[PDB]
Design a protein around this ligand. Structure first.
Ligand code: GLC
Ligand code: GLC
Ligand code: CA
Ligand code: CA
Ligand code: MG
Ligand code: MG
Ligand code: MG
Ligand code: MG
Ligand code: MG
Lengths: 565, 569
């Protein structure tokens, strides 16, 4: 079995730096805090970390509004702290990826200040458009089109200084670059070269579906209105009012991604050492998601686009057949030679055990680790962290502040998945020496924390460790997969490889006991040994499964070790 | 040597052909297809390698919905013929070794049925045979009559019709003339057993039952003594009289409907036990989400339902918009959701949907028939798919579909009309394509009948029909009846389907569903060892049957499909 390049079967962990570890008692996570817990990634069996943005930012969208793409946000630390983090992560054998959003810059960026001021070379750096006349009151200017921001209201903001509207698909303070401007595309290569020269192992790149919008040149000099959804529940200022035909998934965006990959291939060729990678973010239908890998004209894109299917298409409402059918979607659509990946959460979505159930944490981590390719873990999933309670008063997410009110903010807020990491049962769950955490610590940190799980016989974290260890086995790096539902309640996933041990997941995803015939599972010879069990299972690691009839309790997952095929 | 295999029960791997009798063969020049026409062409099913036929309804009917408005469930519609013609059809079909299934709709009866006439007259035994409801109290305008709820008919307008005679509304999920039975009435349920026993006793091999998602609606007992409003869609393009205004929460897919289906299977199992000979079957129709579709098979409490629900995925979820990955992913949906022991089936068309080559492309006909025949289980063919018939042009003036007449106008009728898929069958290039001796047919014959007709395809070297015969012949091979199946996309353009069975020949479909050429590595296809032989090819393929595939690199044209025969595993 030929050793794979590191990025083909890494365990990749997303750090949300503001909530990982506070080293200096300001209630804000920082780079010295990360550096102090780099050993956690080695202990967990993580190969690679990526951080939510740490570049200079006014923090309107907590780092996704970037005012300087070449330096470190002061609350997180200095360039020297970042250099230390790379150095110490590399000494521990970890890979470190930087995340930034190519789509937009902070309105406090020099790019925007100069563009707004029509400074030479900067006039066309962002999307600038004239108003339309208003038939119903001519004093009230109308925006260039009906386009709606992802955070609600118009995607167009008036600039007093420039006397034009600028485009913002996200917050007012996040200004969309013009990706038809060769100088914008050059600046992206400049930013990437700068951080690759510092020794970064690659990039994650956000909000790619929104890169390119309709060219007014193709619409008689107008920005064309997006079609209406025609749904009475959305007013003109509300996300859902429009279908983003002219504002999302434009085929031209992929050409920008293919150019990024061409640049990275040339960089890897010229510098050698370990491959530097680019992973892309886009929430889009599966066929538009697969174009990030490349196209059938032979274009090559991101090393992979993130697979959000366990966020978008599965929940506690899903049965075992739903689990199998959604897992099959990436495996069916992915190009030949493509690397699969599995994402169970992030700082934009409810935490894994909240979207599913508290009794499904171990089964979900097993799916992540046992499916072919790359396991992606969001901060907290290795200990089963739940959504934290955040009051209206304590809400800081711009999405909730702009779309929501004291009665509705919980429908929109991303803050419950951004509460500080549960290190232990000390003040602020050991995230900080201060009680003044930027978001409130979840109420359950005394029951759910890393230190407790390390000192109990059976725990989500000990299961996580056993599963990342299991990924060293040839059966998981190189083995076939077989996946099928045994019932509406239980499915199996088998990894097999001739002459190497067989590994079988059995998972009752339902709220009721289920009894299955193990004779239905391909490649499973009995007796077999329990390798991992859910923390609530009656079966311990080392338990022998001898009967073909197996009763699984609600949420119960087993990994069995069986005879080689 | 090749292993002995046990022959499957007939219904587990039959080629099932839907006849639309009004459009199949006119024996008497009235431009209307009839039973003597079908009898005259029973040899067509043997020639095609069809095992079983089902007929769109041939029971007495005022023809408001061309047979689906049934006025007598125990006799034959006069335009199609007589009970004697039906007994002759069964006898001759059985002599030729064909199975015959009758289709009828349990959901509703004609307003000209004795059931409805007796019910409207509140006759003993019939007063509660249908859903009858008082107006919704209008305390505000006591002089304005309100229907019981906002429920919308599938053919447009209110699902409630006022009866001056009864001074109540009756429910019709379909046309005004199609009256919904009360399926909580034990006498309605017994009458459905009585209908099935009557036709099984005549010698029918089974039933297809229509419109099952609509059987049961909300009980007013659960809604404080009124019929509850269906929730609103909130779509600005629909007003209260337009299908789409509501979401059918209280009118479709109610869990109690499946108990009726499980009772039908119980009745049939008891009938089979008490009559012996070959199994008589029930196939169910419902257009529903996959979880609600699989409940027709049975439930995980051990209830058993239809021998299978029809799989409409090649109608509802695939089209000319689909790539090879879409094809594979949709095929995997039935295989992933079907219960253990469930027999898979595959439907590419019917009289309610556009014809297969119109929904896909003209260059995809052979590949679509190959998928149908090589997938495990039952292949279902709709009249004309064996010759690649396209939708016929039907003007507003020639439109007779009640759905288009009620929902449509000269500008919009084409959005709704089912008539294009109901045009007369193309036998040959004679008057009215040999469907009729007369130039006057009940729907116009498609303009392409001189290019697309059965006699032409029997006489040309290569044709859709000759490919169809080769594929139904191939289904008798153990590899297709008993073999395993492996399906994956090689690219966005091309997928494989492999049927394999140790000691028996391997068969491989390769299909480029795209509008572009594709080159694939046959080294990636499981169980394929080269050299292999072309068994069937698309009529436009570079490769004739017998062509030797020696290279691992294979270039396929847009729409090109091959079946390869390869050495046993
Ligand atoms: O930058 C706009 C958005 O980009 C990405 O999706 C981020 O994950 C999200 O947090 C941010 O709001
Ligand atoms: O009876 C109502 C409906 O039932 C079935 O779906 C028929 O196939 C359709 O043609 C008819 O209109
Ligand atoms: Ca943009
Ligand atoms: Ca009904
Ligand atoms: Mg700090
Ligand atoms: Mg192009
Ligand atoms: Mg006739
Ligand atoms: Mg209105
Ligand atoms: Mg229709």
């Amino acid at each position: 079995v030929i050793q794979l390049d590191w990025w083909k079967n890494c365990v990749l962990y997303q750090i949300y730096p503001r909530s990982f570890k506070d080293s200096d008692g300001d209630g804000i996570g920082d780079l010295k805090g990360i550096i102090s817990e780099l050993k956690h990634f080695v202990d967990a069996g993580v190969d690679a970390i990526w951080m939510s943005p740490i570049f200079e930012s006014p923090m309107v969208d907590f780092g996704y509004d970037i005012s300087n793409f070449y330096d470190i946000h002061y609350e997180y630390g200095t360039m020297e702290d970042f250099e230390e983090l790379l150095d110490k992560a590399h000494e521990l054998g970890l890979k470190v990826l930087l995340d930034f959003v190519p789509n937009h810059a902070s309105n406090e960026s020099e790019y925007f200040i100069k563009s707004e001021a029509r400074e030479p070379g900067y006039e066309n750096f962002f999307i600038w458009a004239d108003p339309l006349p208003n038939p119903e009151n001519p004093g009230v200017r109308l925006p260039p089109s009906n386009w709606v921001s992802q955070f609600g209201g118009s995607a167009w903001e008036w600039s007093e200084k420039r006397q034009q509207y600028y485009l913002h698909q996200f917050a007012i303070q996040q200004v969309d670059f013009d990706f038809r401007n060769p100088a914008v595309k050059q600046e992206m290569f400049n930013i990437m070269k700068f951080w690759l020269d510092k020794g970064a192992d690659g990039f994650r790149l956000d909000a790619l579906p929104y890169l390119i919008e309709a060219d007014p040149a193709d619409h008689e000099g107008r920005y064309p209105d997006d079609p209406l959804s025609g749904l009475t529940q959305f007013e003109s200022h509300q996300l859902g009012y429009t279908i983003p035909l002219y504002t999302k998934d434009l085929i031209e965006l992929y050409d920008v991604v293919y150019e990024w990959r061409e640049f990275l291939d040339e960089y890897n060729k010229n510098h050698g050492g370990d491959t530097r990678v680019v992973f892309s973010e886009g929430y889009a239908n599966v066929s538009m998601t697969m174009l990030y890998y490349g196209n059938e004209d032979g274009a090559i894109g991101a090393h992979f686009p993130f697979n959000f299917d366990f966020i978008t298409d599965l929940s506690s409402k899903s049965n075992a057949r739903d689990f199998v059918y959604i897992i099959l979607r990436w495996l069916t659509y992915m190009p030949y030679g493509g690397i699969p990946n599995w994402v169970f959460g992030n700082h934009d979505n409810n935490r894994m055990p909240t979207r599913f159930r508290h009794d499904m944490v171990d089964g979900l981590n097993i799916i992540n680790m046992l499916l072919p390719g790359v396991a992606v873990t969001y901060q907290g999933e290795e200990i089963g962290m739940r959504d934290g309670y955040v009051s209206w008063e304590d809400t800081v997410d711009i999405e909730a502040c702009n779309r929501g009110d004291p009665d509705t903010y919980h429908l929109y807020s991303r803050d419950p998945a951004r509460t500080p990491y549960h290190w232990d049962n000390s003040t602020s769950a050991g995230f900080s020496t201060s009680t003044n955490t930027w978001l409130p610590v979840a109420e359950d940190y005394q029951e759910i924390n890393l230190a407790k799980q390390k000192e109990t016989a059976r725990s989500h974290f000990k299961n996580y460790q056993a599963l990342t260890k299991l990924r060293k086995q040839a059966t998981l790096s190189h083995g076939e997969y077989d996946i099928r539902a045994l019932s509406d309640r239980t499915f199996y996933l088998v990894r097999s490889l001739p002459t190497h041990d067989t590994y079988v997941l059995l998972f009752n995803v339902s709220e009721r006991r289920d009894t299955v015939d193990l004779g239905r599972v391909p490649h499973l010879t009995l007796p077999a040994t329990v390798y991992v069990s859910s923390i609530h299972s009656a079966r311990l690691a080392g338990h022998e499964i001898t009967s073909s009839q197996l009763s699984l309790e609600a949420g119960e997952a087993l990994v069995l070790k069986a005879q080689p095929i």
